[PDB]
Amino acid sequence: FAPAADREGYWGPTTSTLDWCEENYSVTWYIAEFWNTVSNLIMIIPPMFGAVQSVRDGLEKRYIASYLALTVVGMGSWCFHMTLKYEMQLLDELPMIYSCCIFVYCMFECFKIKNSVNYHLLFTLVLFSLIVTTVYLKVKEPIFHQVMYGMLVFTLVLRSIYIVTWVYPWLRGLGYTSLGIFLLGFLFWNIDNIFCESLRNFRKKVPPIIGITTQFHAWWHILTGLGSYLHILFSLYTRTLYLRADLEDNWETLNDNLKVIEKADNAAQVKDALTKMRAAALDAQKATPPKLEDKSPDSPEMKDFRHGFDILVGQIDDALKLANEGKVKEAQAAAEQLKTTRNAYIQKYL
Ligand SMILES: CCCCCCCC/C=C\CCCCCCCC(=O)OC[C@@H](O)CO
Ligand SMILES: [Ca+2]
Ligand SMILES: [Mg+2]
Ligand SMILES: [Mg+2]
Ligand code: NA
Ligand code: NA
Ligand code: NA
Ligand SMILES: [Zn+2]
């Protein structure tokens, strides 16, 4: 039949190349596709929280950029679903290509030396994103964007599969979980497109989730936004495991900072050295020294190695307490106590 249309237009007409299954300005006349708009908050709030945590912890620029790029994708989608115009449509679909390009760079540079740039991969991703954008603007076909975004996700999937199968099998739960929700989100994306029915919405209890659960494109933002967030976590974790210090590194850090305390002239050096010494002590306490490599981690010699570190950590905490109390000279003099306890309980096992 030919009844009344559910798309209750207000605040400008739809000039965008495509309009989703969600009824235009049905909940409120202020924003179009209400649930497709508000669902982008999980692609705005958590990635921004991840971006500020990354700058505070002093992480690599590419990991800060990856979190901010997802926020741009979220903000762009929030602007596109609200207005439903071609101008804001590009602000949503184009950053998806750029964010994925940043993610591809991070995933292929995870096992590279710190403070190094691969200009060959960087110029390839810039050239790819430039080619994709230029033709997408000229030929306004949305299917082309979906294909080019799909192959970027596919290359990102293969790298994540290679890492979990050959390098870090620990990231199986995180890596595969990210992948699955994303495919679950992509499944729901086609449910809203192909099975576009307002019947469920119309028949009953629209205010509850039954009315709301049928907005599968909104659930797509919820799942891909959580999925991309997970991927960044996965990417970050891959880098953290590679840049992670071993027992030999921690033992060197423990001793270098111990000599720093002995030769220190100001409070900041002593405090800094004790902080770095505590981090190295707790990390070396978990590890097995080369002389105990044959023995079990629960052996009496191993319990003695951990006991020596328990005394050392405690004495570092005592020295940090003195440093935090303004007793610089007393905290500085703790170095000989720390030197004695390592010589009497730890040094014999290395
Ligand atoms: C496994 C990690 C993948 C990282 C992807 C990074 C991009 C951000 C993720 C999701 C944005 C969703 C909201 C934007 C959705 C816009 C609709 C569109 O054109 O989608 C194209 C796809 O349906 C083609 O499959
Ligand atoms: Ca719509
Ligand atoms: Mg670096
Ligand atoms: Mg001074
Ligand atoms: Na329309
Ligand atoms: Na659902
Ligand atoms: Na080493
Ligand atoms: Zn969308």
Numbering used by the authors: 1 to 350
Verbatim from the authors:
Very little is known at the molecular level: ACERs are localized intracellularly in the membrane of the endoplasmic reticulum-Golgi apparatus network and their activity, mainly directed against ceramides with long unsaturated acyl chains (C18:1, C20:1, and C24:1), was shown to be Ca2+-dependent. The critical role of ACERs in human physiology and, in particular ACER3, was recently revealed by clinical data demonstrating that ACER3 deficiency leads to progressive leukodystrophy in early childhood, a disease for which no treatment is available today. We solve a 2.7 Å crystal structure using in meso crystallography that, together with computational studies, reveal at the atomic level how this integral membrane enzyme accommodates and hydrolyzes its ceramide substrate in a Zn2+- and Ca2+-dependent manner. Strikingly, the fold of ACER3 is similar to adiponectin receptors (ADIPORs) with the 7TM harboring a Zn2+ binding site21 despite a very low sequence identity (14% with ADIPOR1 and 10% for ADIPOR2).
Here, we modified ACER3 (residues 1–244) with the BRIL soluble module (thermostabilized apocytochrome b562RIL from Escherichia coli) fused to its C-terminus and showed that this fusion is biologically active; it hydrolyzes C18:1 ceramide substrate in a preferred manner over C18:0 ceramide in detergent micelles. In fact, the crystal structure revealed that it possesses seven alpha-helices forming a 7TM architecture with opposite N- and C-terminus domains. The N-terminus (1–34), devoid of secondary structure, is packed against the bottom of the TM bundle (1–3, 6, and 7) and forms a spiral-like motif in which resides a Ca2+ ion. The crystal structure uncovers a disulfide bond formed between C21 and C196 connecting the N-terminus to TM6. The ACER3 7TM domain contains a large hook-shaped intramembrane pocket directly accessible to the lipid leaflet through two openings between the TM5 and the TM6. Directly below this area appeared a large electron density in the calculated 2Fo–Fc map as well as in the (unbiased) polder OMIT map23 that we tentatively modeled as a mono-olein. At the bottom of the intramembrane pocket, we unambiguously identified a Zn2+ ion. This Zn2+ is coordinated by three His residues (H81TM2, H217TM7, and H221TM7) and a water molecule forming hydrogen bonds with S77TM2 and D92TM3. Interestingly, the crystallographic water molecule that bridges S77TM2, D92TM3, and the Zn2+ ion appears to be suitably placed for a nucleophilic attack on the ceramide carbonyl, suggesting a general acid–base catalytic mechanism in which D92TM3 acts as a proton acceptor/donor (similar to e.g., zinc-dependent proteases)24. The Ca2+ ion is coordinated by six oxygens from the D19 carboxylate (bidentate), the W20 backbone carbonyl, the E22 backbone carbonyl, the N24 side chain carbonyl, and the E33 carboxylate (monodentate).
